[PDB]
Design a binder for this molecule. Structure first.
Ligand code: HEM
Ligand SMILES: N#Cc1ccc([C@H]2CCc3cncn32)c(F)c1
Length: 464
């Protein structure tokens, strides 16, 4: 009356666990993971076993079932390389690394000031200032050239834009990074994140009983990077903590400001989540920005459509920047499209707390279930012509097809801060510049814990 199949009758990935661990040892990474999975899905179907009890799915069909099984305490897998550092230095873990009742406790005291629509209305104007400074700075340099255009690799400037906006919205501090040269503090922070991501892949696929002695140099490499990260994050904390102890302001001065004033969370559990918000707000946000710019340069037909929208609502957004979330549907659709093809978050994890059925297969509890978004977003059955950058496919309205930020109570905490940074930067670049490129070959994607472009194209910014 439904049909359920044995778990042991699942299509099995041909690989051998141990050899892939030795391949990662040798290659110092797993850059082509998204491709090896996409291929396997094409050979075995929309579900298969992979003892790297792990099950890999790809259909919105399955995400919905996975949220139905989400308990009151959804459970992702512990990320030991990250947790190890937290306890080596006697730190508390944030929402990204917690599970069970402690996670629910932190999460419910963070949602109001980090994710709610009322909080977005307060920090969104602050993001807008940074986005306007980004284009104002870019326009000054552009109109200095004879052809009123600047051609460059924008990945540095964009990454320093996301550090600016994130620090302003989190701590209410303004660091001279947009319109000015990078500081050694930021360049060291970005390099630590790069190494923290690299070394994570080298250690996350083998238990600590092996990586301890086969790759101890990497563990050192890994903890050093975190130290540099906790250094940058904690200097942001120590500044705002001392600044608030002497005056409790009456206006909005950032997110972490409210979290400290409320004091619903212990000091160590604010520092913990304040680390995860400072650290996970740079790469994950900046790379979809770059790909959005890239895809618009490849499709000027789509670009001008977005520029028209953004030029019309330009006035009502300068009056109240909050309107950007509702006056720029096409640009919000473009962002949905970028993440469909270039999902910085490759997969969603759930250790199911209860039996379930996927693709008419029995899934026991305690099983790890990974949703592989790279193939989910490329399944022609659900996305007609998935090879095409078509923002208008999201405007019609199809509910679990857009899950780059996860689902359930666990869904991304910074979801709306990221959307505002991406949206507001693209809105002010579209109404002042044209983004053009000769580079029209697809950009190869790399897996270093996140899915990111292995190359950054040359982009021209021509002014209007
Ligand atoms: C395009 C940008 C981003 C994408 C695609 C993304 C993706 C994701 C995904 C897939 C998850 C897992 C959720 C789940 O498994 O249910 C997640 C969780 C999380 N993200 Fe984001 N993220 C982005 C930006 C950010 C930003 C900017 C921040 C902080 C400022 C952030 C902080 C977090 C945290 C703390 C969690 C853990 C939430 C929890 O476990 O309850 N992310 N994100
Ligand atoms: N501490 C810390 C921390 C937490 C999260 C991220 C990124 C990686 C994947 C993801 C999804 N949302 C944000 N992130 C990070 F880089 C550092």
């Amino acid at each position: 009356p439904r049909t359920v199949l044995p778990f042991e009758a699942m299509p099995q990935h041909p690989g051998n666990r141990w050899l892939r661990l030795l391949q990662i040892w040798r290659e110092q990474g797993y850059e082509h993971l998204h491709l090896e999975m996409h291929q396997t899905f094409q050979e075995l179907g929309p579900i298969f076993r992979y003892n790297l009890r792990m099950v890999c799915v790809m259909l919105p069909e399955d995400v919905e079932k996975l949220q139905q099984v989400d308990s009151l305490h959804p459970c992702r897998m512990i990320l030991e390389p990250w947790v190890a550092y937290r306890q080596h230095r006697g730190h508390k873990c944030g929402v990204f690394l917690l599970n069970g009742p402690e996670w629910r406790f932190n999460r419910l005291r963070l949602n109001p000031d980090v994710l709610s629509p009322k909080a977005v209305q307060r920090f969104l104007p602050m993001v807008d200032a940074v986005a306007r400074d980004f284009s104002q700075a870019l326009k000054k340099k552009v109109l200095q050239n004879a052809r009123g255009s600047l051609t460059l690799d924008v990945q540095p400037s964009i990454f320093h834009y996301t550090i600016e906006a994130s620090n302003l919205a989190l701590f209410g501090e303004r660091l001279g990074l947009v319109g000015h040269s990078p500081s050694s503090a930021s360049l060291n922070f970005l390099h630590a994140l790069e190494v923290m991501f690299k070394s994570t892949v080298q250690l996350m696929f083998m238990p600590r009983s092996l990586s301890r002695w086969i790759s101890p140099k990497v563990w050192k490499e890994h903890f050093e990077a975190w130290d540099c990260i906790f250094q940058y994050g904690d200097n942001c904390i120590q500044k705002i903590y001392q600044e608030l102890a002497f005056n409790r302001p009456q206006h909005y001065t950032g997110i972490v400001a409210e979290l400290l004033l409320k004091a619903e969370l212990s000091l160590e559990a604010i520092k913990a989540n304040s680390m995860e918000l400072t650290a996970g707000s740079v790469d994950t946000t900046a790379f979809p920005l770059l790909m959005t710019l890239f895809e618009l340069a490849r499709n000027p037909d789509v670009q001008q459509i977005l520029r028209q929208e953004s030029l019309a609502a330009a006035a009502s957004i300068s009056e109240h920047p909050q309107k950007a979330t509702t006056e720029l549907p096409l640009l919000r659709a473009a962002l949905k499209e970028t993440l469909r093809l270039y999902p910085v978050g490759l997969f969603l994890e759930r250790v199911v707390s209860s039996d379930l059925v996927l693709q008419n297969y029995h899934i026991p509890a305690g099983t790890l279930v990974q949703v592989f978004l790279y193939s989910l977003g490329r399944n022609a059955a659900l996305f007609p012509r998935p090879e095409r950058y078509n923002p208008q496919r999201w405007l019609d309205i199809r509910n679990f097809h857009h899950v780059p930020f996860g689902f359930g109570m666990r869904q991304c905490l910074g979801r709306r801060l990221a959307e505002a940074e991406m949206l507001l930067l693209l809105h002010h670049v579209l109404k002042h510049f044209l983004v053009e490129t000769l580079t029209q070959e697809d950009i190869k994607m790399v897996y270093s814990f996140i899915l990111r472009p292995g190359t950054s194209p040359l982009l021209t910014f021509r002014a209007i």
